[PDB]
Write an enzyme that holds these catalytic residues in place. Sequence first.
Site, mmCIF file in Angstrom:
data_model
loop_
_atom_site.group_PDB
_atom_site.id
_atom_site.type_symbol
_atom_site.label_atom_id
_atom_site.label_comp_id
_atom_site.label_asym_id
_atom_site.label_seq_id
_atom_site.Cartn_x
_atom_site.Cartn_y
_atom_site.Cartn_z
ATOM 1 C CG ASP A 173 -1.868 0.904 1.341
ATOM 2 O OD1 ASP A 173 -2.959 1.176 0.546
ATOM 3 O OD2 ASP A 173 -1.548 1.872 2.115
ATOM 4 C CD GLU B 133 -2.290 2.146 -3.593
ATOM 5 O OE1 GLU B 133 -1.593 2.200 -2.575
ATOM 6 O OE2 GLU B 133 -3.476 2.505 -3.735
#
Length: 557
Positions: free
Chosen positions: A200, A254
């Site tokens: 993330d 990401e």
Amino acid sequence: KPGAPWWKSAVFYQVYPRSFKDTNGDGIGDFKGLTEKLDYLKGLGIDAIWINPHYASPNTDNGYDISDYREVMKEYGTMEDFDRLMAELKKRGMRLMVDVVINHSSDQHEWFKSSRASKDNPYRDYYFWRDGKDGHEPNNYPSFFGGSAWEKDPVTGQYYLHYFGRQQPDLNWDTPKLREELYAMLRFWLDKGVSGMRFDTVATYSKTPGFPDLTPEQMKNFAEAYTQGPNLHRYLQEMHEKVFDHYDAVTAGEIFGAPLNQVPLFIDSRRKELDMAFTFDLIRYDRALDRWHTIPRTLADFRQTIDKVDAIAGEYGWNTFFLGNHDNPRAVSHFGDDRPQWREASAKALATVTLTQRGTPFIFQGDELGMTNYPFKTLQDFDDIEVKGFFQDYVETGKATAEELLTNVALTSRDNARTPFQWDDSANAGFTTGKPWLKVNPNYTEINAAREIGDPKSVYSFYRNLISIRHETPALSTGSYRDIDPSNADVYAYTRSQDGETYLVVVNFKAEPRSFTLPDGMHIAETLIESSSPAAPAAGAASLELQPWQSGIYKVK
Ligand SMILES: [Ca+2]
């Protein structure tokens, strides 16, 4: 020759647990629900699943604010349930990719409770604490979720940094002991057999020394400045040396906010950082800078962006490919035409594109059914903390009316992707026996897994067949990619090639008939599959006549 990693040829499915399947009536999906549906995913042809955060969390950002990295989220079940999910996946030869959120933790994490206590606390530097300046915050950094990225804590009088929510303080990667704690945390899950990790907001780990103000220009696109910390790749390389070099898990980042020309630094296999990239260029290709308005684009923009993204993988990098996820509007609504008469046809067309791109495809839960955006009626119909942030930054400041925010965010909101999965046509689409945490789309009466599976002509059946074809055709996963005409805004056409075998993909993006002339010297040899076509072309055809939204995959000669 040497073969490619299992991950370059795999088809991944993304499960947002919170909205996949509830098994105890509390209106929130859980691990038992997912485990009970593994036969459904295996039958669809899925090799691996990526689940969103499943750790202990106050859920201010639905799992992305973690209070304990070694315990399972209470709403999803227990560690035993996680272990059972793993075991059942393995019995089916499926692998699990988990979400790793280490740019920040919850402010309820014990590290933060300790950190905030005093300037001399051993954990003080597990986060960023700074004095304000000129009577206000340390600098002008804005938060993605509303207001300033700096929050004053009266316990010490200093401000802590949070790029995201106020309850998601950023972890301090410049602190060795914290980096070591994170590595030990990763090993905890990897020692359990996890096959992959999705990082993330991986590009924001490094912070800028001194925290100077962003210039007026940088402020226009602050997301990008936050990806320019000077020690980023040093930290990623260290994470690889101390953790990933010791396992055989695939890692994906990401890469939020970073310019595309920097993506190779993260994925070039020779650099020993990450294996695959999740970029935002295509999924936000029609999003305004404020992230809540849209800008009209055409297929020419779509394909040109894909060309740029593919070029970045070069020879040693690798891309994931996706048209949908939990942070964006629904694929068919966003890139297709979700009107009743075109929803199924355009969803099939987008399925053809998804499964024939060069990279590892991720299908977002529900897109295999043709799920659409949700008909929000009021701002209260959204759960997403990001929408509350837009209300704070644009409505309370007088820049926009509540009506304007509703109108526009309805087309871009992350909640469009989070409505419960539509299993059948029982109460709340068979997702729960209770009250769903987020309302089910009323279209479940027409769009649901039970109906889709029983129909050979359905979107589901089409995805299933495309997945079988891809699994049988190496060129469709690891082959080269060549866009036949990046300027064409009507029909998307490209070839995929490998070991002397070439396939042609042709997709009509218009709701009108169109024609397509093959490149000189190229002729159709076979037709692998088509959607919305009344007939396959003749062997040897040097051109094709396309119905509205028709898609096809052909072996050429
Ligand atoms: Ca539940």
